[PDB]
């Protein structure tokens, strides 16, 4: 068994986290292989 | 093995050195990640082993040791946080307002943040710290940047 896991942290919200990114509205399609594409 | 709730790296030594191939979430005794990270293979946790339990290529999700447990959903209004766990780097929270993937089968939240491949499976959180889905299945947009669905499973 090649793959192994190691703990990296608790799952918590951080107040005053760095903020980035925009908020695109995109038409997309999802194929049987789980890949998204643009319409 | 360690089954404490939290976020974990998914590592391999099959390549040069130790490589991070993705990330996942331990909750209620079940480990949750994206299918493309593990391709459904068994995992090691210390001396112990985690066997796959459920998965689906099209959803791009997999659970180990039990059924999918995560069921919180984006409210469609508020900012969220990606708890990015990049290879070789400390866990970091990044706050953002999701966009939307419109599909023929309905709308999904999306996050416009670009992290290494080995960051796939990192949790996206709401303001109460609940996991609303996992990062790393998405699309390349016109300018060549990346946007990830907020991918969430079903708790049966």
Swiss-Prot record, chain A:
Region annotated Disordered, chain positions: 9-31
Cytoplasmic compartment spans: 1-39
Domain of life per record: Viruses
Membrane topology (UniProt): Multi-pass membrane protein
Localization (cell): Host endoplasmic reticulum membrane
UniProt region (Interacts with and activates NS3 protease), positions on chain: 5-39
Subunit text: Forms a heterodimer with serine protease NS3. May form homooligomers. Interacts with human SPCS1. Interacts with non-structural protein 2A.
Role of this protein: Required cofactor for the serine protease function of NS3.
The record's note on its domains: The central disordered region transitions to ordered by binding to NS3.
Full protein name: Serine protease subunit NS2B
Organism encoding this protein: Zika virus
Lineage: Viruses, Riboviria, Orthornavirae, Kitrinoviricota, Flasuviricetes
């Amino acid at each position: 068994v090649d793959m192994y896991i190691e703990r990296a942290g608790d799952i918590t919200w951080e107040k005053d986290a760095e903020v980035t990114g925009n908020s695109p509205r995109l038409d997309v399609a999802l194929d049987e292989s789980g890949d998204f594409s643009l319409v | 093995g360690e089954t404490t709730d939290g976020v974990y790296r998914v590592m391999t030594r099959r390549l040069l050195g130790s490589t991070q191939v993705g990330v996942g979430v331990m909750q209620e005794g079940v480990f949750h990640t994206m299918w493309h990270v593990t391709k459904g293979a068994a995992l090691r946790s210390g001396e112990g082993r985690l066997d796959p339990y459920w998965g689906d290529v099209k959803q791009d999700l997999v659970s180990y040791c039990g059924p999918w447990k995560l069921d919180a959903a984006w409210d469609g209004l508020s900012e969220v946080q990606l708890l990015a766990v990049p290879p070789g780097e400390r866990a970091k929270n990044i706050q953002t307002l999701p966009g939307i993937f419109k599909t023929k089968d309905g709308d999904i939240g999306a996050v416009a943040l670009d992290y290494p491949a080995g960051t796939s499976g990192s949790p996206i959180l709401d303001k109460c710290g609940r996991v609303i889905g996992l990062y790393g299945n998405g699309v390349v947009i016109k300018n060549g940047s990346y946007v990830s669905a907020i991918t969430q499973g079903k708790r049966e």
